[PDB]
Design a protein around this ligand. Structure first.
Ligand SMILES: *C(=O)N1C[C@H](NOS(=O)(=O)O)CC[C@H]1C(=O)NOCCN
Ligand SMILES: *C(=O)N1C[C@H](NOS(=O)(=O)O)CC[C@H]1C(=O)NOCCN
Ligand SMILES: [Cl-]
Ligand SMILES: [Cl-]
Ligand SMILES: [Cl-]
Lengths: 239, 239
């Protein structure tokens, strides 16, 4: 009753010839829902979804002074045009500019990064690999339910960082807002798995979500949000 | 070249046999634009846009502890259905719930309300009339350009309240968010005059805006955003 399985959601993966898990948390009702209880606990590389805790650490250690501080383009031309320009934290999260956050990581350092993830209870708290790439190709792993447990602490300012830090990152996670709802979320792609994790704010409740799916090619990345919104629409969380 | 008149925007008021003013401020270029220099500097009752400074003062004085504190419906049935329910700061601003804010004002009190509005350099800084209604039927007045100045201070956290108070109110002002822009803004109506004030966040710039227009009946209230958005589209600030 605290966790329920709804296999009817699998049709949202089936219709797109894909496979994955959607995990929802109803905060008011303290209830979880997923299409696959097993895969909901499978831990994967966080990839770009690691920008949430990475932002928190860089803000709270003073590696990032605020959301307007500019991090200049390094002049290296990269495959994603939006990366080859100056960014602040907000645009850095919106375009998921990895090189910005790799520099963040180097400045944090191994010891403090590892110490902070333990304080966050984040995933398997393993940073083996390059200090500036372990969340792309090192030891760190996190499941969808783990993502939800981390996002809920952030929502309630219960992470061991300043309230200011936590508010700035939730500001930067802002994806969508209209008269019906607000989504604060972050996507990720590790070359094999696609992530979308965040929450949907409503007038009188909040719905946490975390999804991942098999992503053999970059062409289907749009599906991360499509399949999630189909689920939220089936559950009358969004119109 | 600080302020410039663009009378073409009058076509957007003319198109709806209406009259009023749009004022824009290009933050990067420190340059302002309006269709009506005279009306840009004319002072009106702020009405519900006063929820912005009221929220700031309520938070900073501790009348409001955070954005989730609930203010229960007093049971008085009022003409706007969304008012007859419990609200927190986010929903009270979203639904422009005056009784919530009149209670704020009553708890703030005349002496502190006056001192804070003076600290904010807000309008004519005159709170003559009922402490819980002076912004609707009292002696307080503010111009569109004065609105811009106030909002620019809030954006830059330069008001004489805490950084946290300013951040919470900008969160409460969140009106729209998509991949192209964010609008944080507040509407208002005093039964003769309609207001829309706020700003449009872009990747690399912010456009402040304050508009008002003659509002003989409530039926044209959506023109506040419609006419503003026509201007922003014309200036290519939004698609
Ligand atoms: C993080 O997951 N990133 C950065 C960027 N984010 O795109 S998103 O999936 O829309 O958030 C692109 C994908 C990924 C990478 O850094 N890419 O390197 C390996 C994954 N393709
Ligand atoms: C403030 O301007 N208000 C409160 C409420 N907000 O609607 S909005 O204009 O869409 O922000 C209704 C309109 C207005 C009134 O209070 N209306 O009566 C005027 C005297 N209170
Ligand atoms: Cl990253
Ligand atoms: Cl926000
Ligand atoms: Cl009000």
């Amino acid at each position: 009753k605290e966790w329920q399985e709804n296999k009817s959601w699998n049709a949202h993966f089936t219709e797109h010839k894909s496979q994955g898990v959607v995990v929802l948390w109803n905060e008011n009702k303290q209830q979880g829902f997923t299409n696959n209880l097993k895969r909901a606990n499978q831990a994967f590389l966080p990839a770009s979804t690691f920008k949430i805790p990475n932002s928190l650490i860089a803000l709270d250690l003073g590696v990032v002074k605020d959301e307007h501080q500019v991090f200049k383009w390094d002049g290296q031309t990269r495959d994603i045009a939006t990366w080859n320009r100056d960014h602040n934290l907000i645009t850095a999260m919106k375009y998921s500019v990895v090189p910005v956050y790799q520099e963040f990581a180097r400045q944090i350092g191994e010891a403090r990064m590892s110490k902070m993830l333990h304080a966050f209870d984040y995933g398997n708290e393993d940073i083996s690999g390059n200090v500036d790439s372990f969340w792309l190709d090192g030891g760190i792993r996190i499941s969808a339910t783990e993502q939800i447990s981390f996002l809920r602490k952030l929502y309630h300012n219960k992470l061991h960082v300043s309230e200011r830090s936590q508010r700035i990152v939730k500001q930067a996670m802002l994806t969508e807002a209209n008269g019906d709802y607000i989504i604060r979320a972050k996507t990720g792609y590790d070359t094999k798995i696609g992530w979308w994790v965040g929450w949907v704010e409503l007038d009188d409740n909040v719905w946490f979500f975390a999804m991942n799916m098999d992503m053999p090619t970059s062409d289907g990345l749009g599906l991360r949000q499509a399949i999630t919104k189909e689920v939220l629409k089936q559950e009358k969380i969004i119109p």
